[PDB]
């Protein structure tokens, strides 16, 4: 299906302004930044966010920010934690009299609220400190035999994979015999092993290339994985609060292994989907972010099949995020709450021929 397309958000209109420079603040430094009111998602670093600015005041604020650092803040709602977002893609058409501004930004850093202030105009400012990003050394760097230090460097990585991993575990955690724990216990707090396990788990949701699809940095890999997990607002904010990369990787692995059921949020008991059916159609991952015609943001997850839903409306190709597909509104069979849409192709020779796109908000993970 050429999963590259959904990333580009071609439905915006293309011909988008591009910026090459980026700006990073200083860790623990206090900075004052404006907050857009419309945005409500819990942004994560490295995640792309599209937005449609309508109201004149926010349009003027965005226009001003263009020449400025091109950055603002999104509060993960009371507001205690938030994420800075740098705007990189900008466009304006002005058609229909109103100034319809289209923007795309990316998360940069995590901050905690220090003070929030409101101006007469209506926009809100906030002074906040930049939380640091901490990386721990190798767990075996404390206890070690210096003579064996020459054996830490391994030959380049290539049945065969299993043997190589066994040799890697046996050789790296040798000095573990000097402590009161076995090697397999230390292997559970290792970045490479957890990343490999997460790659194995993701391989069932896609046929992607391991080398290029995911980054080689533990922090970037952890944030990318976190950006594509169907979890609640509470779970996502709890993940965001975590400081160390190892803790975030362990939490992500635990969530993937344990949470298997996806139920209606409103009902809290009407089972909707199982993880086994989760499949990805966009390189961003199983779950992506899009914007509706009126600018509202929605996180959408693709699944082969669904259940306990009722269909209203008729198929329509207007403003469809997925090229060459229609949609019909899907409501919960019990509470009639919107859950998402059913996408059915109009041309044949498509893999798949139909599927469902469910919004993240209505989902609720459940552990059998």
């Amino acid at each position: 299906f050429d999963t590259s397309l959904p990333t580009s958000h071609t439905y915006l209109g293309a011909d988008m302004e591009e910026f090459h420079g980026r700006t990073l603040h200083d860790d623990d430094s206090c900075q004052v930044i404006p907050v857009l009111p419309q945005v409500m998602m819990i942004l994560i670093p490295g995640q792309t966010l599209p937005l449609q600015l309508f109201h004149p005041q926010e349009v003027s604020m965005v226009r001003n920010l263009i020449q400025k650092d091109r950055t603002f803040a999104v509060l993960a709602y009371e507001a205690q934690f938030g994420t800075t977002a740098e705007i990189y893609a900008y466009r304006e058409e002005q058609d229909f009299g109103i100034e319809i501004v289209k923007v795309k930004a990316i998360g940069r850093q995590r901050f905690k609220v220090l003070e929030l202030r409101t101006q007469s105009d209506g926009i809100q400012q906030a002074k906040v400190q930049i939380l640091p990003e901490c990386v721990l050394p190798s767990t075996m760097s404390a206890v070690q035999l210096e003579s064996l230090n020459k054996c830490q460097i391994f030959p380049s990585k290539p049945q065969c994979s299993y043997k190589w991993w066994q040799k890697y575990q046996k050789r790296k955690f040798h000095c573990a015999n000097l402590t009161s724990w076995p090697r397999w216990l230390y292997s559970l707090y290792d970045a490479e092993t957890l990343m490999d396990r997460i790659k194995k788990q993701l391989r069932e949701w896609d046929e992607n290339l391991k080398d290029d699809s995911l980054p080689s940095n533990p922090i970037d890999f952890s944030y990318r994985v976190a950006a594509c997990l169907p979890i609640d607002d509470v779970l996502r904010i709890q993940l965001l609060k975590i400081g160390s990369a190892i803790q975030r990787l362990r939490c992500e692995l635990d969530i993937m292994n344990k949470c298997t059921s996806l139920c209606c949020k409103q009902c809290q008991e009407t089972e909707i989907t199982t993880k086994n059916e989760i499949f990805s159609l966009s390189l961003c991952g199983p779950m992506a972010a899009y914007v509706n015609p009126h600018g509202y943001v929605h996180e959408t997850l693709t699944v082969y099949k669904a259940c306990n839903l009722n269909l209203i409306g008729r198929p329509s190709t207007e403003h469809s995020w997925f090229p060459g597909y229609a949609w019909t509104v899907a409501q919960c069979k019990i509470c009639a709450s919107h859950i998402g849409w059913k996408f059915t192709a109009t041309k044949k020779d498509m893999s798949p021929q139909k599927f469902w796109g469910l919004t993240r908000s209505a989902l609720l993970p459940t552990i059998p």
Binding site: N292, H294, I312, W327, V329
Partner: peptide
């Protein structure tokens, strides 16, 4: 003729869309 701004569903009665709006709201 009627249609919800948020979900995009199409309705016919004003009461239908009024009650629909409550589902995805505060």
């Amino acid at each position: 003729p009627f249609q919800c701004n948020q979900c995009g569903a199409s309705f016919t009665q004003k009461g239908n869309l009024l009650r629909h709006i409550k589902l995805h709201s505060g």
